[PDB]
Amino acid sequence: PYTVVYFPVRGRCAALRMLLADQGQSWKEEVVTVETWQEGSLKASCLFGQLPKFQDGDLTLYQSNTILRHLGRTLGLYGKDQQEAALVDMVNDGVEDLRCKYISLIYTNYEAGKDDYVKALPGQLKPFETLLSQNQGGKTFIVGDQISFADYNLLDLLLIHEVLAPGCLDAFPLLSAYVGRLSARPKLKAFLASPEYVNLPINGNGKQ
Template identity: 70%
Template sequence: VPPYTIVYFPSRGRCEVMRMLLADQGQSWKEEVVTLDVWEQGTFKASCLFGQIPKFQDGELTLYQSNTILRHLGRSFGLYGKDQQEAALVDMVNDGLEDLFRRIARQYRHILKEGKDQYQKELPGHLKPFETLLAQNRGGQSFIVGDQISFADYRLLDVLLNLELLFPGYLNDFPLFSAYVARLKSRPKLKAFLESPEHVNRPLAACIKM
C-alpha cells in the first residue's frame, strides 16, 4: 500500500506539483477524489482541519495546507537546498510562486472568457523575478536555486505548464524558461508522468474543463 494519499478535487489545482514531485522521486501514491457535489454537501468539508483541501496522508501523519505539504516533501526527499541559505531561497521562490498562483486563480474565469490578451501582456512582469533568479544561477542552465532540484523547481514547472495551457506557445517569448521546462520535462520519471493519461486528461481546475 503506498504510504502517500492525496485527497483532492478531480483537477490539477494545488496538487499537481505534489504529484510531479512524487513521480520524479520514484514514489507511488493513492488518490482519493472529492467531487464538487460531495464537497458542497459540507460533511466532508467540516471534517477537514481548516475546512479545505488538499489533505495529504503520509503514513500516520495527516497534513493540510498545500505549502506545508510541499515543505514536508522537500525535507523528506532532500529537495530543500544543500544548506540554510539555499533553503531560505527555496522558500522565497515558493512564496513568490504562491502569490502568482493566487493571482492566476483569482482571474482564471476572466482569463478564459475575455482577458487572455491583457493578461498575456502582463506575463513578463509577473515572471520577471523568477527569470532573474534563474539567470543568476549558472546563467539559467541549472535549477532555480543551487545545483540540485528542489521543491521550488516542481512548483515553478507547475506554474509554467499551467500558463502553457492558458496561453499556448507563450514560452516562445521566454527562451530561458523554455529551455528550463525542456530540461525538467526530460527527466525520465517526470517525463513519464507528464505524458501519462492521468496528467494529460486532468483539468486545470475542478470548476471548468480545459
C-alpha cells in the first residue's frame, strides 16, 4: 500500500495526505523524531538526504512534489488531457515557488521578514485568483472540471497562509470560496478536523 515517512509535522506532507484522505486511500504513517533523524542512518539512506520518503509497494520515492505527481498520475488527478496536465504542472510549480518563500520565512527570518512577506502576499496570491477566474468563473477547480493534485497543494498553501496572515484571502472572492468549497468535501472535511491533522504543528520550529 502506501507509507509516508516524515517528521511529526504537516509541512510538505500536508497536501499529499489531504489528497490520500479525500481520495479514500489508506496509508501508513512512519513518524521520524528529531532524535532518530539526528542519529544519521536514516538521513544517509535518503536519496537527497531528506524526508518525506514515500513507499508505494516496492517503489520508493523522495521529494514531496514527486509524490504528489505520482499519486495524481496513478489516481487520475492530473487533468483530462495533455493540455490540462501542463496547466496542472504550471499551477503546482507556482505553488511550490511560494511554498519555498514561505518555508524560507518560517525558518530563515520570521521576525524580521514577516511584515515584508505579508505586504508582498497579495501579489503572490493574485495569479491563483486569476487562474480561477479563467476556469468556469472559479466555480470548480484550479484546472479543468476535475480535482487534480495541484488543487490539494494549492489548498494547503492557502490554508497555511491564512494562519500566517489572517484575512489574506478576503480580497480574493474566488480563492476564498475555493478554500471553503474544497474544505467542505466530506472525506477532506473529516480529515482536516481529525487529531491526525489538527494535533500536528504546521512547521517544525513552532512558527506559523
